[PDB]
Design a protein around this ligand. Structure first.
Ligand SMILES: [Ca+2]
Ligand SMILES: [Ca+2]
Ligand SMILES: [Ca+2]
Ligand SMILES: [Ca+2]
Lengths: 296, 6
C-alpha cells in the first residue's frame, strides 16, 4: 500500500547559519507508508571552500538507501574530483559545473558496484535538487522532479526544470535506449526520468551512462549572486510543488518572512499548507535566506 | 506516485 489511514504529521526541523546565510528545513512523512526523503545542509566546505555552502533535497523511491547514501556522500564526490578542482587556484564556473556532473556520474557508478556485490531487494533510486553556493555564484542543481527556486527583488527569478519522462529531451533518450513512455512513466512503471540508483533502468547495452533509460546526469545552472537583491532560495520535493505553484509558494514565503525570522517555522508552515491542500506524499523543504531577505 | 500508479 502507498498510503496510511491517518497521516504521520511529525516534523523534523534543522537550522543553521554562516557565510552570511541562514537556513531552516522541514521534513514530514505525511500520508505515505514510508519516509524516503533525505537532505543535506552544510555551511562551509573543507579544504579551502570554507566560504562555500551546499543544500540538497533527495526524494527516494523504492527504498531510502540511495537517498541516504546521496545525502551522506554526494557533496564529497562533487568536490573531490579532478573536474571540480580544475588544477589551478579556485574552480572556475566551468570547473564547478563539470565537477557537479562528474560527481553525479561517479557516486552513481560507486553505488552501482555496492548494490551489485551485496545483492538484495534494495533496487532504490533518488532524485536530487540542490544549490552549491560560492561567494560569487549560486549553482542550481537538478536531477529529477524536485525543484529549486530563487527569489530576487521580491520576485521569482529562477526555478529548475523538472525532469519528466514526457518532456522532449527525456522521451528522446528513453526511446533511443529502446524504452517507451507509457501512462507518463518510463516503460510504464517508474514516473522518474532522471535519478541516481534505479540500476534496473541502467542496463542498456551500447548506451553510455547519460543515455540509459533513467539518467543520473544533473542540470546545472549558475547564477551570479546579487548581494543587494538575492533574498532566498526554496528547495523542495514534488510533494510540495504538486500542490503549490512557483509564484504562490514564493509569495507565501516572502510574506511569512515579514512576520517571522524562524525559518524552521516557515518551513513547517509550507509543509502543513501543502498537507492541508491534499498532498499525500512525503515532503521536505529547505529555506536558505540571504542577508537581504525580507526582514521581520 | 513514483511507482504506485493510482
Ligand atoms: Ca519518494
Ligand atoms: Ca508529481
Ligand atoms: Ca515525491
Ligand atoms: Ca525551533
Amino acid at each position: 500500500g502507498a498510503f496510511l489511514d491517518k497521516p504521520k504529521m511529525e516534523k523534523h526541523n534543522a537550522q543553521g547559519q554562516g557565510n552570511g546565510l541562514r537556513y531552516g528545513l522541514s521534513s514530514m512523512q505525511g500520508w505515505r507508508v514510508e519516509m524516503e526523503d533525505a537532505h543535506t545542509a552544510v555551511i562551509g566546505l573543507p579544504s579551502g571552500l570554507e566560504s562555500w555552502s551546499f543544500f540538497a533535497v533527495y526524494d527516494g523511491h523504492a527504498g531510502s538507501q540511495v537517498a541516504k547514501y546521496c545525502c551522506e556522500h554526494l557533496l564529497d564526490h562533487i568536490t573531490n574530483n579532478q573536474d571540480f578542482k580544475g588544477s589551478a587556484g579556485a574552480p572556475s564556473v566551468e570547473n564547478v559545473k563539470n565537477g557537479i556532473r562528474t560527481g553525479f556520474l561517479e557516486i552513481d557508478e560507486h553505488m552501482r558496484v555496492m548494490s551489485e556485490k551485496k545483492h538484495g531487494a534494495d533496487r532504490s533510486g533518488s532524485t536530487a535538487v540542490g544549490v552549491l553556493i560560492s561567494p560569487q555564484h549560486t549553482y542550481f542543481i537538478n536531477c529529477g522532479e524536485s525543484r529549486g527556486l530563487l527569489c530576487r527583488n521580491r520576485k521569482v527569478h529562477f526555478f529548475t526544470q523538472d525532469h519528466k519522462p514526457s518532456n522532449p529531451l527525456e522521451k528522446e533518450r528513453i526511446q533511443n535506449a529502446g524504452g517507451s513512455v507509457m501512462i507518463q512513466r518510463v516503460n510504464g512503471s517508474l514516473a522518474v526520468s532522471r535519478a541516481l540508483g534505479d540500476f534496473d533502468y541502467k542496463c542498456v547495452h551500447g548506451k553510455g551512462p547519460t543515455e540509459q533509460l533513467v539518467s543520473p546526469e544533473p542540470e546545472v545552472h549558475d547564477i551570479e549572486r546579487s548581494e543587494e537583491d538575492d533574498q532566498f532560495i526554496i528547495l523542495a520535493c514534488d510533494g510540495i510543488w504538486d500542490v503549490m505553484g512557483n509564484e504562490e509558494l514564493c509569495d507565501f514565503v516572502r510574506s511569512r518572512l515579514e512576520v517571522t525570522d524562524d525559518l524552521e517555522k516557515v518551513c513547517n508552515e509550507v509543509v502543513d499548507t501543502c498537507l492541508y491542500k491534499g498532498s499525500r506524499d512525503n515532503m521536505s523543504v529547505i529555506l536558505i535566506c540571504f542577508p537581504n531577505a525580507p526582514k521581520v | 506516485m513514483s511507482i504506485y500508479v493510482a
